[PDB]
Amino acid sequence: TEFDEATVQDVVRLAGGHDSELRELTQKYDPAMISRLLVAEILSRCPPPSNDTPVLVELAIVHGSERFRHFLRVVRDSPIRPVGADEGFVGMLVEYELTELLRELFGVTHERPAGVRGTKLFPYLTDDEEAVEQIGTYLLAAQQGTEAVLAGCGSRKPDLSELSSRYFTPKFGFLHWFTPHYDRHFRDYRNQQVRVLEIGVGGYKHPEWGGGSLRMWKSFFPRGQIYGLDIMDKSHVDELRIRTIQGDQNDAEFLDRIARRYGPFDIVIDDGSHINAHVRTSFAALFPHVRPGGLYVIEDMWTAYWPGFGGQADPQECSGTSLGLLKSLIDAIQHQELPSDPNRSPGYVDRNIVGLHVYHNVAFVEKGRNDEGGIPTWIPRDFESLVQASSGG
Amino acid sequence: EFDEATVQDVVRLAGGHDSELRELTQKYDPAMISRLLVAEILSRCPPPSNDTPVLVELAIVHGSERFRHFLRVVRDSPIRPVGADEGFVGMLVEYELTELLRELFGVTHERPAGVRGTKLFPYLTDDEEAVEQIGTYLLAAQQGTEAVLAGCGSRKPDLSELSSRYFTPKFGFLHWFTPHYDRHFRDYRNQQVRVLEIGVGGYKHPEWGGGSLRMWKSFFPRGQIYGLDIMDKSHVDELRIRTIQGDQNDAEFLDRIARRYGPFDIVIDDGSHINAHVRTSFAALFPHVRPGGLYVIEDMWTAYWPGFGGQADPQECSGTSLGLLKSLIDAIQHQELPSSPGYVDRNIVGLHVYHNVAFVEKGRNDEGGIPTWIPRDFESLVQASS
Amino acid sequence: EFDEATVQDVVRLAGGHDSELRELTQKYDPAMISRLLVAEILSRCPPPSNDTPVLVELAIVHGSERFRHFLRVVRDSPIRPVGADEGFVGMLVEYELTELLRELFGVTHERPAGVRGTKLFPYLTDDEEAVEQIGTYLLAAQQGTEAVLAGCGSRKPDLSELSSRYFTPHYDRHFRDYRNQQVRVLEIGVGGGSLRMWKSFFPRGQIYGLDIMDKSHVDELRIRTIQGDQNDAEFLDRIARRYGPFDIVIDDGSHVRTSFAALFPHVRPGGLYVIEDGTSLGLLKSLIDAIQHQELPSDPNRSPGYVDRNIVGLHVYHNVAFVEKGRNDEGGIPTWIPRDFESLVQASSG
Amino acid sequence: EFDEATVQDVVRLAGGHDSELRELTQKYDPAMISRLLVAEILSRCPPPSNDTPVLVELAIVHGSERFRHFLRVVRDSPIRPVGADEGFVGMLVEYELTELLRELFGVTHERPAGVRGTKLFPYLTDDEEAVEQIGTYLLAAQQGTEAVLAGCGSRKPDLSELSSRYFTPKFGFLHWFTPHYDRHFRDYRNQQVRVLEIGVGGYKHPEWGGGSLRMWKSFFPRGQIYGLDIMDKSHVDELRIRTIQGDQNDAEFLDRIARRYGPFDIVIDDGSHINAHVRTSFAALFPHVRPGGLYVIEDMWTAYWPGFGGQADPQECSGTSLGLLKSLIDAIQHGYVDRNIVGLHVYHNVAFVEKGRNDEGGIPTW
């Protein structure tokens, strides 16, 4: 909407810096625009409210003498939205300095249990005949309302399992159990300004469904930029820090173009067509654009056993399956151990895979320089010889 | 030395609450337990860096009894107990027995202070006496004390550093394993793990070997370590480390030691590297890994070498360790096969492959395959999901 | 309901290795243990967020035995055991008894898979007239199962979220490292939401709540309330001897000098005395001197008190302070160190 | 040898994403960065443990260029670059420049593999000659490589161990501070911190001091360390450590340097221990501590001793460091200081003060 992608990215980049970068940021961009950007981001981070009684939390973003006042309406079963100053009972004033709020949302920072904000309970309540009866009405509501808003004003790791039920995406709960693995592999990336590409947005031909996992990744990586690729148009999903791209997963040249434009990627996820040949095309085309230390993730390898997706009944005939790829990746890892051959060159994947993690219906591939060196030729090539050479006479 | 059953029981109770610490110190003689802890501390101290030799007095206190131990600390030598007069005593360190038990073998949070008492230059009566000793001993006492105290706790060691300390080829020259081991193993450090490593080291050399067993002992403060080797390795044995003599290719014998000493949280194969041996040991010992545990295969490079029973062609993997790992991918996905699963099928939940080392996760593989009513064709799936 | 000493024995054994878990299952009846785990599971489950009511079957298996439990899971209502008839079973969840013990009360690493079995729509015959049921129960069964599964583990909860369901960021900082221990927690001053909060946060814990009023209705698994006078030093010593020693004591200001003097001695070394919300302020200041007492000039006339010898840390925040129990015996600065600045310069310059 | 502004810029860009690392390598000569990283690695290497001396070749690669450094590695000697002919080359270690940047100065997750390339016994032609050298060099090579590689990353060091290594009294004889420092400082380690320690060490002695400065440099891989001392300690200055000469009891002077070098994430007072000095420094420097930062006071023991402006009576605390701490307790429950203290942590002879607005949980008193 208002917020240009390069600008959001620049803001996140500077927010991760020290004092000089924070000053630089607020000098480079209008403080009113930045405060607007933070509110939009906060509205996305807030968990569902639990309070039965509608309440207003006032979020005051302060910069020098300027106060950008946002009155957030908070109630169970309604998205948290900004309203007019008079449109409810202000249960809590929450105050942040602009640079502090930037650090909390987009910074590289340590946990801060206190000292980031100021709060005042029932800020506009005057001592009247109505006062005490109004305190009974609102005390719990103000507390719960505030909890929800405060949780949106920071970068505490969300629970992926919970986000999958919240954003309506099949990662955990019924058909799959991916999220605890995703958590283990992804959580160490959360300090970084990651670029994440997911192939397959969701909902298929439905004019409204999809983008659940995309929103999941936005919540999980507070400093990330998420991209979604789908053969269908999913522009209705675009929001702050989420970009949807329309194209074919099995078009390698096109994959190369978008990776050049938007890459390189810390993380690529394949959850698209699940057609076996597609997975192989996507991987060969997109693995070179994963950063060293990044991950390439393949979901739903179950289609490797099925003809309707270009797979095979017999698990042994894994010629062109996604499982065949995984198996071959083991040899790619071990490639420096092959008997020397003056004609053979290690392929690109050979040189660039350093780990493979395989779980039920999900596999993680580690991108890295695979150049540890094979076992020297002067270590004997049979067991009884090795014993002799290792027994120190 | 100390009976294994006793050592394991002490570790068990040290991991409990106040009632268990009482039970422990009433079941066994406090004098006996003190010598056990000191033995442990000796193997736990990092190598000292002080140039001038110093004594750290460790006094272990229980009730009215006070057990005094004098540790000689100097660089290039191992820390060892000596008599009270056999050096300058730079530091007195005092522990309650139950507190020392907690720090060495407990299930405990990190405690930055209040676990001990300390008295510097303890036997220097007069001030003028201490002043003349600052030049010679202040630094030395500080460095010596630092090393002993490191031996008196449970702080996680650096496995890559241990590789160099204990002369094991796990990191730094032929291999680069230790960062993978750290990632996979560190969350077990609380537990009274039982670890089996196949291959003690040294082969037929009469002295060498056991470096990796000493590594695991350091890394797992509450663990029992077992090493298997075809050659006698009795000289490696020490508190919390037992060597077993036998053939990793004898499936009956492996069942025997598994039943005697298991079940294992962790098994590591770093033995002959003969492809068949690797397969025999996996089939025999995998059933004896606890759910949530790990089976680790090292040095799969031999999969490509016929002198180890491997094949030069990676596609001809039917008899190799790599062929096994590939078969394990199918095991993980087994419930996705069209319409009995074997033991391994039902019990593998993760595979991690790195250069020359693979970790296998033992667990109930029973998430359920993709249900019948989900379409088995791409075109069919698209219309059903809209 | 369940015998306290038994519950503690179960939790003690659950935190061991294989021989302790088999001891557990031999020592006590597997059906009893089963009801205890379910009882515990119901206390941990988050409030469900699914609109269409669904049943989750929890099958607990020990050898030849199988204990089934059908749990009603719907929004705005607590998860409750029900009869198999009284709703639609959307998910079967299956645990080995010993594995569930490990997950709820064990000392264990995080295990992202392999702890259970799952069968989606466990009792559906064919697809000829049973797709209409698939169309409305798919999303609810996923959300309902997510809530049950969260009750079946020991994932650290959010104390902020627990405060709403039943400030806290400082409690998390100081309390979280204790979570795999079989702690004993005493809260002074108790609605018993606060005790239910610590129960949730300490999966292996025993919680005790002291109050002058009878609060026996608050009692449940791993929560006992004690009734008596918080201003009576002797009584406090007596209940500490009985139920202690405590890893953590939480003392509300709404007094303190009395309860702190009587109870600090019963805090475990490495434990915490927590003071929430004049009287309190003065005590905190003095604790600074208690920490520094080995630095006082010597006097055979003044001798260090219990607290002096036993405090190793003070953490003071807005309306809450944490006092670290431990041996305060590091040694004071030795006499041979100069006691004015100019002399310290000289003696420290080679 | 390296410009302090340039180093801080390099650390800042290193902690960014791909486009920042590209920017880094365009902005500065890659040769120069190579020397800077090697310099950094040399101070991060633990003491080596190999008996037989060995050479570890560090090759840093950018695009086409290859910068080769040969490091001598032997017990009791510091790792230093020497010619290719001054020993046996045990190991070739190879880094892409931007990858090494990331490993040393980046904001990065832990990477157990794929950050480098390694070639053992790299200049031995045939197999028969290499077998000859197993008995002499293999173990030496492994141990040497391990020491170098330890200095090529950012693994949290052990402060207690650094205390013995760098000769500072923070742990092991007079004090037991380091486990507290570790708990309070460890979460700051991926931030480009600015650390100011009052008291460099060594006093009038012409060589001693700097121990603790080197400690912080080692502990904070992206940090800039500053040390203030009344005496001149210019011999201590190295990459990422600057020493400043001046009096801690000169409020105006402190404000002057706090504006030049601040704001600080951490300030540590281990200076004169004169009680008035401690209170002057705090009042002057606390305003320049960043929100979420720490002010640390060491050696409050002098609060009891008149020779440092203290008092034997713990109740006569009005002008002592203890008295200051006690009034910090008041501020936390309600001057600049009052509105900006959110936490106090007191341990034997060391206190940690948390900086942040004590503005939270306000209620209308009526």
Ligand SMILES: CC[C@H]1OC(=O)/C=C/[C@H](C)[C@@H](O[C@@H]2O[C@H](C)C[C@H](N(C)C)[C@H]2O)[C@@H](C)C[C@@H](C)C(=O)/C=C/C=C/[C@@H]1CO[C@@H]1O[C@H](C)[C@@H](O)[C@@H](O)[C@H]1O
């Ligand atoms: C020929 C091949 C053999 O090389 C040796 O035996 C070298 C022995 C050295 C000479 C020893 O150093 C001596 O220690 C003395 C105490 C003082 C000595 N000196 C300083 C007086 C000092 O020189 C070692 C003890 C040093 C440590 C690093 C070590 O354990 C090395 C083991 C090397 C094993 C390989 C076989 O590896 C196996 O097969 C495959 C290659 C792989 O599968 C691999 O994983 C493994 O399973």
Ligand SMILES: CC[C@H]1OC(=O)/C=C/[C@H](C)[C@@H](O[C@@H]2O[C@H](C)C[C@H](N(C)C)[C@H]2O)[C@@H](C)C[C@@H](C)C(=O)/C=C/C=C/[C@@H]1CO[C@@H]1O[C@H](C)[C@@H](O)[C@@H](O)[C@H]1O
């Ligand atoms: C007399 C008091 C003075 O003692 C000294 O000066 C002792 C100097 C040693 C003799 C040095 O060792 C020498 O290093 C040579 C390079 C090789 C030498 N050898 C092996 C050939 C070797 O002997 C030190 C460098 C060793 C390290 C541990 C160190 O830094 C010790 C500092 C001690 C400072 C105290 C004053 O402390 C201050 O005042 C308060 C008491 C406290 O508040 C305190 O915190 C502090 O602020």
Ligand SMILES: Nc1ncnc2c1ncn2[C@@H]1O[C@H](CSCC[C@H](N)C(=O)O)[C@@H](O)[C@H]1O
């Ligand atoms: N060849 C192809 N290229 C790109 N996208 C494709 C494709 N075939 C199918 N898709 C898209 O991939 C999606 C599969 S569903 C993706 C689920 C989503 N990632 C989530 O977790 O919520 C569908 O929306 C479909 O439109």
Ligand SMILES: Nc1ncnc2c1ncn2[C@@H]1O[C@H](CSCC[C@H](N)C(=O)O)[C@@H](O)[C@H]1O
């Ligand atoms: N069939 C067999 N059964 C058991 N051990 C065997 C074996 N064949 C060889 N070994 C042993 O396996 C060892 C391999 S070396 C072990 C190295 C050790 N893990 C370390 O890292 O330090 C040798 O000591 C050898 O004696």
Ligand SMILES: Nc1ncnc2c1ncn2[C@@H]1O[C@H](CSCC[C@H](N)C(=O)O)[C@@H](O)[C@H]1O
């Ligand atoms: N008024 C003053 N201003 C600044 N520095 C002072 C001072 N009075 C003394 N000092 C210096 O403070 C230092 C105290 S020793 C510092 C020890 C060092 N921090 C370490 O941990 O190793 C001495 O070097 C002394 O010269």
Ligand SMILES: [Mg+2]
């Ligand atoms: Mg999917």
Ligand SMILES: [Mg+2]
């Ligand atoms: Mg090996």
Ligand SMILES: [Mg+2]
């Ligand atoms: Mg000092």
